[PDB]
Amino acid sequence: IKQKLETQFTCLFCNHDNSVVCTLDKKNSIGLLECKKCNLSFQAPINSLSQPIDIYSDWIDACE
Template identity: 65%
Template structure:
């Protein structure tokens, strides 16, 4: 009779690796943000190779690079929401309070028109 073939072992499962490079929120370049994690110090750092933007967040033993990136996204959204709520952004002067951004009263303009 014929020799029986030995069966192959089970196929190895491919382990998916999580990304460590991300898109920058400020310059919108793909794969320009590098994440480095120091688990002994409990600190995760993000750095954009293009625009130089940096971010630092606290991490724990179970944290992954995507966790640091999501903390950065949340922090940027919080700053944007704060900017919409209480401040008016003026390109010439930076951020000013709503009360200071209001124009001067129209009484001065009325006085000037009466002189003519």
């Protein structure tokens, strides 16, 4: 079953903190970051061990 989790991460674009939601679909190995404020979205691959800090880390490197 999918996991819809709220986090305390800051969006890299709109800068609103505590407004990034992480949807981890392990059945298809696809993780999804969403911003509850400016509405941006970022997709990245996840394994079985990953957690909201794993894809949020991949989002920091995808920008820089």
